[PDB]
Amino acid sequence: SHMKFGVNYTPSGEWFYTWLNPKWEVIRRDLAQIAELGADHVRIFPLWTLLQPNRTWINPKALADVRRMVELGGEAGLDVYVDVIQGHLSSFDFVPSWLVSWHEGSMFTDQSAIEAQSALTEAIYGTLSDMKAFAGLTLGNECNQFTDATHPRRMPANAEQIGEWLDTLIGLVAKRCRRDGRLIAHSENDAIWYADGHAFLPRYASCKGDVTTVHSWVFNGTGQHYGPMSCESLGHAAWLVELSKAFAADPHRPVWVQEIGAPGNVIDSADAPEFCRRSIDAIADCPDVFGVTWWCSHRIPSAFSDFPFFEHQLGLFDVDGTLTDVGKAFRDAIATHRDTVAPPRTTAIVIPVDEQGDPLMRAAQAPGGSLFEAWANLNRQGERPCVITSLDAGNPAKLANRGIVRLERVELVAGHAYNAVSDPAFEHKGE
Amino acid sequence: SHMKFGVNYTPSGEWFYTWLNPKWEVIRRDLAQIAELGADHVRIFPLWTLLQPNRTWINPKALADVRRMVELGGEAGLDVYVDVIQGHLSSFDFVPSWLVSWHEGSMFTDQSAIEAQSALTEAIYGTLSDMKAFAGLTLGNECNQFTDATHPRRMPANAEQIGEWLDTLIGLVAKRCRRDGRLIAHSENDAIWYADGHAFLPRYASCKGDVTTVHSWVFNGTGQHYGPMSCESLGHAAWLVELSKAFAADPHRPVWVQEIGAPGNVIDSADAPEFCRRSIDAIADCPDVFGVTWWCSHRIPSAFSDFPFFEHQLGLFDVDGTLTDVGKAFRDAIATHRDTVAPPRTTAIVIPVDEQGDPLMRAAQAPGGSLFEAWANLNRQGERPCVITSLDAGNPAKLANRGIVRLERVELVAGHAYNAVSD
Numbered sequence: 001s002h003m004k005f006g007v008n009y010t011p012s013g014e015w016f017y018t019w020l021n022p023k024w025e026v027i028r029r030d031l032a033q034i035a036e037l038g039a040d041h042v043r044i045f046p047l048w049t050l051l052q053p054n055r056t057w058i059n060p061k062a063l064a065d066v067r068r069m070v071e072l073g074g075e076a077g078l079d080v081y082v083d084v085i086q087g088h089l090s091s092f093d094f095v096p097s098w099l100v101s102w103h104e105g106s107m108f109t110d111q112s113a114i115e116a117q118s119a120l121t122e123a124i125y126g127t128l129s130d131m132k133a134f135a136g137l138t139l140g141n142e143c144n145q146f147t148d149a150t151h152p153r154r155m156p157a158n159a160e161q162i163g164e165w166l167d168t169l170i171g172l173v174a175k176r177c178r179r180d181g182r183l184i185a186h187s188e189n190d191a192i193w194y195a196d197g198h199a200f201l202p203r204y205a206s207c208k209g210d211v212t213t214v215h216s217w218v219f220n221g222t223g224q225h226y227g228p229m230s231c232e233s234l235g236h237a238a239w240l241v242e243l244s245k246a247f248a249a250d251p252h253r254p255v256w257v258q259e260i261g262a263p264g265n266v267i268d269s270a271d272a273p274e275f276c277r278r279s280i281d282a283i284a285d286c287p288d289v290f291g292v293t294w295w296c297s298h299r300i301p302s303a304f305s306d307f308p309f310f311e312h313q314l315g316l317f318d319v320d321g322t323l324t325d326v327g328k329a330f331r332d333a334i335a336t337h338r339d340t341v342a343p344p345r346t347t348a349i350v351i352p353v354d355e356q357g358d359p360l361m362r363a364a365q366a367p368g369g370s371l372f373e374a375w376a377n378l379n380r381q382g383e384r385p386c387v388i389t390s391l392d393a394g395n396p397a398k399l400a401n402r403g404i405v406r407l408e409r410v411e412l413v414a415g416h417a418y419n420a421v422s423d424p425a426f427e428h429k430g431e
Numbered sequence: 432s433h434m435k436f437g438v439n440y441t442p443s444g445e446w447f448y449t450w451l452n453p454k455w456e457v458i459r460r461d462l463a464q465i466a467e468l469g470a471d472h473v474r475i476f477p478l479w480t481l482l483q484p485n486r487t488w489i490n491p492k493a494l495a496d497v498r499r500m501v502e503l504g505g506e507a508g509l510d511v512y513v514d515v516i517q518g519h520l521s522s523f524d525f526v527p528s529w530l531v532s533w534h535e536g537s538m539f540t541d542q543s544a545i546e547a548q549s550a551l552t553e554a555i556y557g558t559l560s561d562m563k564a565f566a567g568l569t570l571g572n573e574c575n576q577f578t579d580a581t582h583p584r585r586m587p588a589n590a591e592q593i594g595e596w597l598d599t600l601i602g603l604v605a606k607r608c609r610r611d612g613r614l615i616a617h618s619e620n621d622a623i624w625y626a627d628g629h630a631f632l633p634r635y636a637s638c639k640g641d642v643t644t645v646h647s648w649v650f651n652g653t654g655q656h657y658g659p660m661s662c663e664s665l666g667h668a669a670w671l672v673e674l675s676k677a678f679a680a681d682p683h684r685p686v687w688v689q690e691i692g693a694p695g696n697v698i699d700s701a702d703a704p705e706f707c708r709r710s711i712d713a714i715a716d717c718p719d720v721f722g723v724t725w726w727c728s729h730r731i732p733s734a735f736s737d738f739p740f741f742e743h744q745l746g747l748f749d750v751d752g753t754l755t756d757v758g759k760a761f762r763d764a765i766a767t768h769r770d771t772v773a774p775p776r777t778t779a780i781v782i783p784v785d786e787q788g789d790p791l792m793r794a795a796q797a798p799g800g801s802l803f804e805a806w807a808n809l810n811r812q813g814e815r816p817c818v819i820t821s822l823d824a825g826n827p828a829k830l831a832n833r834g835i836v837r838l839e840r841v842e843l844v845a846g847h848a849y850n851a852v853s854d
């Protein structure tokens with residue numbers, strides 16, 4: 001299998017505020033620039049506040065604007081993946097008025113809100129279903145952040161309710177997607193892998209939807225604790241790939257590195273091209289990688305305020321469309337790994353899990369944890385490790401299915417390097 | 432003085448959700464209907480989330496759409512008053528992403544947020560400054576609800592900080608408004624009059640800005656406690672008018688009944704037309720009333736959810752564009768009171784206040800309180816009462832300035848009917 005290469009599309013000039021009045025000629029130029037990198041896809045982000053301003057009214061103009069952006073992606077030669085519910089983007093929440101303050105509720109447990117998200121998922125798919133360039137959808141960007149204990153306006157849910165939420169929304173379109181040749185996925189930030197007590201469970205990402213998504217951001221403590229250009233940092237995206245497979249029922253389920261960037265709050269801007277190149281080298285040595293989607297296409301204009309300062313500099317293109325040095329590195333990484341095939345990984349570290357296949361201690365597989373470091377140490381040694389659970393460790397069918405010949409046991413100890421936020425201004429904000 | 436008559440404009444068909452993609456031919460039809468009533472003005476409500484999606488970027492298309500709505504109001508023969516910051520509408524909050532959750536802050540005390548609201552106020556005035564139909568500006572609809580303790584995501588502030596917030600935003604445009612022939616005002620819900628401990632103080636509404644605004648809603652406990660068609664309920668808007676004057680430094684400052692409706696959660700729908708007519712009768716007998724602005728023009732379509740159901744029925748025009756029975760009553764009230772001049776009110780009840788002019792007990796002037804009931808009882812008796820503070824009572828200059836010849840002193844007794852419901 002060969003990896004797809006794509007970009008998370010942040011519109012130049014107006015960022016996601018462009019949805020208020022999209023400048024289609026600029027958007028056309030944006031997408032042509034992305035296609036010229038050699039990218040085969042983009043991921044795009046409509047805003048929930050504009051799509052569904054009332055629980056029972058979806059704005060047809062917002063739907064038509066999503067269709068027009070998909071249309072222009074196809075005209076640039078790009079497949080277009082659409083995230084349905086934002087929801088959350090770049091430290092900001094976009095929640096419709098009917099779910100805040102006087103109408104505060106949980107998108108995960110309020111049945112009328114679930115029905116609204118169901119209507120929106122169906123409306124987005126149905127609006128785009130006739131489009132050759134529409135490649136698939138993700139329920140929404142890192143929606144799990146809303147239910148984590150760290151969120152300042154937390155939407156409550158237990159793990160069973162999260163599973164029902166995922167099953168409900170994915171089940172609306174899964175068969176259509178299967179018949180049409182499209183993808184359905186969901187997306188969580190790395191709390192699903194790292195945060196003990198978090199209501200989204202690893203197996204949800206690795207078993208629900210068509211492909212596992214991971215978002216790899218080394219400002220999560222990895223770059224700070226080990227160094228921005230350490231093997232732990234450069235291999236972090238590959239670690240998430242291999243970690244996620246331990247919780248997959250399917251031994252060859254594809255893993256989508258749906259976000260990776262070189263954040264300037266931990267990586268020096270002069271090192272970002274090398275971080276890009278070497279992170280993708282490590283990803284390409286993991287089998288069954290669905291693709292790599294870089295964050296992000298275009299720098300945020302300096303006129304916009306309240307972003308973490310590093311966010312402004314994440315773009316492959318500057319605000320006028322000029323290719324940045326990281327853009328050159330991503331372009332070159334695409335050319336390098338267009339046909340890279342990773343050989344099987346045959347030495348596995350074992351994650352102790354409970355009877356449901358959930359980790360006994362997610363902190364042990366977080367930065368600084370024993371499982372995190374056991375994998376990093378073997379990768380550093382050239383052993384190319386994979387990851388399984390203790391349940392699978394006693395199932396030769398699954399082991400043979402994955403080609404695993406060697407097992408390494410490791411005891412659980414929490415790391416303390418993991419930080420659940422990307423800026424110190426967002427810390428200590430739980431209710 | 433003669434009263435203006437206007438309507439709070441809720442766009443037909445799509446409500447304030449139309450701002451995403453306004454249907455200008457429908458909006459033109461909406462405004463023509465309002466003018467056909469005999470209304471001389473509308474009050475309109477852009478959304479803060481669309482105007483200012485980033486703290487340091489105001490959306491030019493959102494500004495242009497406000498300009499276009501004002502233009503169409505003028506073409507219908509209407510003056511247009513614009514509320515800058517919504518903020519709050521019909522039980523919903525519209526707060527930009529840069530002031531929520533991970534970026535949660537208080538619009539009243541966060542200096543960077545205050546500068547953003549300043550930039551937005553200046554952008555709205557400047558966008559509209561060349562429009563003949565642009566008549567004035569209100570800072571925002573019932574902005575004080577964000578700082579009330581009842582708010583689930585409260586923006587904290589003390590009373591001094593609220594005064595500074597008002598002074599800052601009003602001062603940006605007050606001189607321009609005066610030179611241009613326009614109005615600057617601010618708007619609070621009735622917590623300012625009724626809620627002990629609330630950081631917005633009565634004197635703020637009656638002294639800051641060019642006219643006092645009141646929003647009169649008898650679901651605040653008045654209709655529940657006395658009855659929807661009682662004199663206490665029918666006179667509630669006139670009560671707010673006369674109560675507000677007690678805290679004004681200017682003895683003839685105009686009072687704008689900027690919202691009044693007949694809410695179906697307390698008033699039977701069959702009684703709403705007579706509630707309209709008789710409430711305006713009582714308002715029309717108060718001097719210096721700037722105008723009466725009915726809530727609202729057009730009913731919310733039944734396809735939209737999560738509104739308190741009574742809210743759906745508040746429009747003067749039905750979802751099919753037909754004039755409702757309340758619309759007929761409002762139309763007739765305009766014709767009845769176009770030329771009404773209210774004679775001076777000369778018997779005053781006295782509100783005990785402290786040395787800063789703030790009430791000793793706001794609950795006593797709230798529904799069920801002795802001062803509330805003293806006014807309602809005198810008005811029912813035909814005594815046409817007004818209201819002063821205990822400070823005004825020992826100041827013959829002000830007394831003579833208002834023509835007050837008789838005082839009624841009242842013992843303080845707290846009311847308990849106020850239920851803090853403003854939506």
Ligand SMILES: CC(=O)N[C@@H]1[C@@H](O)[C@H](O)[C@@H](CO)O[C@H]1O
Nearest residue numbers: 090091189217420421422423426
């Ligand atoms: C409040 C905050 O910083 N949230 C960020 C989020 O924007 C980002 O997408 C995610 C990536 O894992 O990391 C979180 O910490």
